[PDB]
Amino acid sequence: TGNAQKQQDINHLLDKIYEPTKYPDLKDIAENFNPLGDTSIYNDHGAAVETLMKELNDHRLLEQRHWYSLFNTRQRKEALMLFAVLNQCKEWYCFRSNAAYFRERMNEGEFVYALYVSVIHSKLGDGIVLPPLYQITPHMFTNSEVIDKAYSAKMTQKPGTFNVSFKNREQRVAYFGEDIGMNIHHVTWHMDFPFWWEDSYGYHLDRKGELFFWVHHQLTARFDFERLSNWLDPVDELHWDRIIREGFAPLTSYKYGGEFPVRPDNIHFEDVDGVAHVHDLEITESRIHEAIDHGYITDSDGHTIDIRQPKGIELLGDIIE
Amino acid sequence: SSKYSSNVQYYGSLHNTAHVMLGRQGDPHGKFNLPPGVMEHFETATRDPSFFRLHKYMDNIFKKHTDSFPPYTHDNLEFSGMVVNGVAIDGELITFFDEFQYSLINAVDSGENIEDVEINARVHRLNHNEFTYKITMSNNNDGERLATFRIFLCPIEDNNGITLTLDEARWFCIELDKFFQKVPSGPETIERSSKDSSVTVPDMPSFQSLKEQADNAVNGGLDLSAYERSCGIPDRMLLPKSKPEGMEFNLYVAVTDGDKDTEGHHAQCGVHGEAYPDNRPLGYPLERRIPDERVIDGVSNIKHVVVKIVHHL
Ligand SMILES: [Cu+2]
Ligand SMILES: [Cu+2]
Numbered sequence: 231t232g233n234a235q236k237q238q239d240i241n242h243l244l245d246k247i248y249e250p251t252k253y254p255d256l257k258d259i260a261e262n263f264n265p266l267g268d269t270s271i272y273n274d275h276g277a278a279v280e281t282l283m284k285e286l287n288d289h290r291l292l293e294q295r296h297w298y299s300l301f302n303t304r305q306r307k308e309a310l311m312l313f314a315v316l317n318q319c320k321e322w323y324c325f326r327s328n329a330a331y332f333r334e335r336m337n338e339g340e341f342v343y344a345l346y347v348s349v350i351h352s353k354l355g356d357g358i359v360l361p362p363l364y365q366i367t368p369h370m371f372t373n374s375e376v377i378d379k380a381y382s383a384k385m386t387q388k389p390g391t392f393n394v395s396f397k398n399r400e401q402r403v404a405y406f407g408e409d410i411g412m413n414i415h416h417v418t419w420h421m422d423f424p425f426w427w428e429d430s431y432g433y434h435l436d437r438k439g440e441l442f443f444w445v446h447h448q449l450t451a452r453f454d455f456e457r458l459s460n461w462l463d464p465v466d467e468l469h470w471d472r473i474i475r476e477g478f479a480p481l482t483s484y485k486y487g488g489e490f491p492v493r494p495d496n497i498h499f500e501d502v503d504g505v506a507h508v509h510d511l512e513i514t515e516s517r518i519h520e521a522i523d524h525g526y527i528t529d530s531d532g533h534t535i536d537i538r539q540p541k542g543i544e545l546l547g548d549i550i551e
Numbered sequence: 552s553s554k555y556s557s558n559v560q561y562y563g564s565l566h567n568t569a570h571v572m573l574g575r576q577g578d579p580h581g582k583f584n585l586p587p588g589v590m591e592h593f594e595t596a597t598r599d600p601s602f603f604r605l606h607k608y609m610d611n612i613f614k615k616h617t618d619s620f621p622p623y624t625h626d627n628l629e630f631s632g633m634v635v636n637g638v639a640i641d642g643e644l645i646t647f648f649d650e651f652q653y654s655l656i657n658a659v660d661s662g663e664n665i666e667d668v669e670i671n672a673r674v675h676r677l678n679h680n681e682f683t684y685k686i687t688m689s690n691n692n693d694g695e696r697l698a699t700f701r702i703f704l705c706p707i708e709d710n711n712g713i714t715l716t717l718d719e720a721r722w723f724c725i726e727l728d729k730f731f732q733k734v735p736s737g738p739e740t741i742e743r744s745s746k747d748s749s750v751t752v753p754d755m756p757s758f759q760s761l762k763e764q765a766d767n768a769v770n771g772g773l774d775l776s777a778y779e780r781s782c783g784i785p786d787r788m789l790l791p792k793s794k795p796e797g798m799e800f801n802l803y804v805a806v807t808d809g810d811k812d813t814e815g816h817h818a819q820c821g822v823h824g825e826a827y828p829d830n831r832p833l834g835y836p837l838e839r840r841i842p843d844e845r846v847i848d849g850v851s852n853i854k855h856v857v858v859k860i861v862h863h864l
Contacts, residue, residue, distance in 0.1 A: 523561050
């Protein structure tokens with residue numbers, strides 16, 4: 231152990247993530263290790279490990295040098311299996327090993343995501359400070375221009391530093407939304423208290439519900455404020471039966487993936503195949519809005535669980551998000 | 552949504568809300584600061600057309616419930632013994648247009664030492680002529696028996712002129728009168744007048760009139776006590792306007808059994824906690840689906856006779 235060790239290992243793992251590791255130790259590990267030959271390092275007698283492997287084997291896991299959204303029900307599951315191994319390691323010998331072994335044959339997004347959540351929640355990651363996403367995977371936080379300026383630097387081997395960019399809009403209150411600090415927090419807040427947490431993982435995040443209610447109420451408030459300061463008016467509430475009045479072009483690009491799709495203004499909400507119907511929300515919204523109005527949330531049995539009490543708003547945040 | 556509401560947090564208030572919602576229609580976000588609208592006040596909604604539109608909608612909300620009951624049986628309607636023998640209008644149903652006058656005085660501000668000029672307003676109101684019912688009927692009963700005299704005036708053709716069905720038309724009927732009388736052991740012939748109707752109230756005494764007469768009872772040693780209870784529609788409104796050519800409506804005389812009706816207790820304008828005296832639900836017995844007229848038609852105590860209304864121009 232140590233930390234200036236644990237730490238070191240981490241830094242090595244998350245270095246030039248888009249390419250096979252250059253740190254020799256990480257690679258003989260990456261090669262010689264077998265997550266299935268001493269089911270003892272694992273507190274599960276390695277059921278986790280044996281489940282990743284099975285996938286890695288039938289090679290039914292998402293490919294490397296490809297994109298990944300945490301919203302993809304499979305990509306998530308895969309990402310989250312790495313969490314589950316890293317998670318039942320008794321000590322560093324087992325983490326390093328895996329987050330090396332996998333690091334090299336699992337996709338980067340799943341991997342980056344897996345490592346962070348794992349470091350954050352697992353018993354074994356106390357000493358560590360995680361590098362800032364913004365510098366680990368800069369495509370998600372950096373412009374499309376600066377990114378290209380950087381690819382040029384590299385092509386020509388001439389260094390530099392480029393100035394990023396952001397009178398026609400409300401990309402006047404932009405400084406708020408596009409800040410690398412907020413973006414960090416926003417992701418972190420959701421790594422700290424993930425929507426996918428099952429108490430099987432080890433403990434119980436306390437009031438994730440009110441936490442959820444609140445954190446978004448404050449972005450929402452903080453946001454409303456900035457627009458105040460800009461002769462702008464408080465933000466419209468979004469409706470599924472209305473036009474998406476205000477659209478934007480992000481001018482942002484994926485590393486592996488392409489350029490983020492843009493939205494034209496005055497658009498009509500389309501039923502999106504694979505996710506869900508527009509109406510599917512409308513009804514959800516109703517079911518929600520009826521719990522609030524009745525006084526109770528009704529479970530699967532037709533058991534009414536009361537929410538006209540203090541535990542109220544969290545029970546509500548559990549069903550809303 | 553009154554406050555007798557079972558779950559006001561859930562069923563909110565359709566009808567009140569629907570009153571304020573129809574009125575700022577002229578300024579929702581209130582960028583104009585227009586005052587409230589005709590529909591957001593009771594002395595003035597009847598004015599705007601959608602008033603009737605919006606109440607047709609609340610009406611059929613109730614009709615939905617109203618109509619979920621099983622129609623009524625023969626033994627449901629009959630009040631054995633009693634049998635309406637004949638129904639007659641003694642007089643003429645003629646409706647026309649009177650003229651009335653109220654005073655714009657509380658309207659003009661006149662402060663002090665500047666004196667009061669009598670200004671008035673003259674309006675055009677509808678009217679009919681008193682008429683009287685000659686209800687002919689024997690109480691085959693050995694008894695003396697109480698009786699609810701229930702009389703609705705339903706319609707007969709369409710305005711396409713299709714002619715409805717006391718199904719199509721049961722719900723279209725307007726209550727004309729409702730009164731309880733004892734009917735002696737045989738041939739009787741009840742006579743009753745436009746005037747005595749229970750759903751009616753005369754015009755009201757003027758203000759100066761009630762001033763004069765209060766004033767003369769001070770300097771003197773008051774009973775009108777005819778207008779202390781208010782509920783009804785104007786006597787002038789009793790019958791409908793009709794055609795100059797005249798129309799024939801259908802008169803419905805249904806006599807139900809007083810003892811079960813009033814099985815318990817003004818009582819017209821229960822303003823003060825006074826238990827409504829009739830117990831039959833309201834609109835009895837045309838409030839329920841009437842699938843085969845075959846039935847209304849074979850209870851002795853129900854009788855229908857066609858009347859005719861004419862409008863003098
Ligand atoms: Cu969030
Ligand atoms: Cu109303």
